[PDB]
Design a binder for this molecule. Sequence first.
Ligand code: MED
Ligand code: MED
Ligand SMILES: [Zn+2]
Ligand SMILES: [Zn+2]
Lengths: 178, 178
Amino acid sequence: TDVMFKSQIANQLKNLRKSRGLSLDATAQLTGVSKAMLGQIERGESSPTIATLWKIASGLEASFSAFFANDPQLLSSERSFPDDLNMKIHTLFPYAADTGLEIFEITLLDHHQQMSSPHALGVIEYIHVLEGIMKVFFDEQWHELQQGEHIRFFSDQPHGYAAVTEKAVFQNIVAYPR
Amino acid sequence: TDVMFKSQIANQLKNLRKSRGLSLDATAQLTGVSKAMLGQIERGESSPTIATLWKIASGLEASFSAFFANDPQLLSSERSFPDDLNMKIHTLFPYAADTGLEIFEITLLDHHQQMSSPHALGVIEYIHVLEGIMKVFFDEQWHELQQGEHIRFFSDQPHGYAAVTEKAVFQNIVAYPR
Ligand code: MED
Ligand code: MED
Ligand SMILES: [Zn+2]
Ligand SMILES: [Zn+2]
């Protein structure tokens, strides 16, 4: 499936880019991802990480869900990304333009730590811990959250998530500007 | 010493800022650190992390060493920063304008992971592992390095360091554009 993952992302990334009439170099400037890497991704040569995907989506001002718009069904089954084995994504609600929401249930394993690049301007995130203890980084600091605890923050800044207990599960609501 | 740390940083940050004729708001825009936090730091109300210090120095286009220029001696003794207990900094060579180099010996403990904001444009880093196993993040990926291994990268991008073994020690050369 790692190879099928590559082809899915490669083809849709190209569609998203071409639909916007963007060159690879212009897309590189927008996303902060090298033109070289973007070329490799579209050719199915490199498997992008979840963090790189968000970086690209942010630059294109697209939702994470947009990477699967050609085959919406895939999103509800895409739990394990090849380059992120200690993190599993369960999409509860794919991006909806009317509410601007994208909702995921994330499972962090082996005390994995996930740092992210800023998402698009104005994108806001909500976090609700379902199990374990985890920490969320933003505004230059880590915020520890136990089961049941919650918090929201402006995600258009360097941020991150980390499981303090070996395992942690949390709901993540990503709200895009309307 | 945590309090002495705060006063040292508070006073020199203000000097560096004032010497440049910058307002707090202008400094906020340059560094990406909120004006609120910058105000608290200068008043000795909040203890900045090593990551925040680099973020500020980068925006002011100053060296990390500049934060101790009022009392150079302090740098050679400042090993443990209050908000970074799993990371110890041993400055071997403070910033020198003729070579543009700043050299540190860093000890990471309890498999600590250190993510950093981009340093100033053109700043380059060299890494040489003295002990243990560690990983360095840049160009969207982690690079694992064992004892004796080395690597260099452009640090004006999101990057980071992580000890894979409980403890890891490495030399870090930070070269600023001349
Ligand atoms: C649903 S993927 C994990 C969450 C996403 N907001 C990120 O920063 O990576
Ligand atoms: C000497 S402090 C650790 C190294 C510094 N280049 C950083 O990114 O944090
Ligand atoms: Zn995020
Ligand atoms: Zn650095």
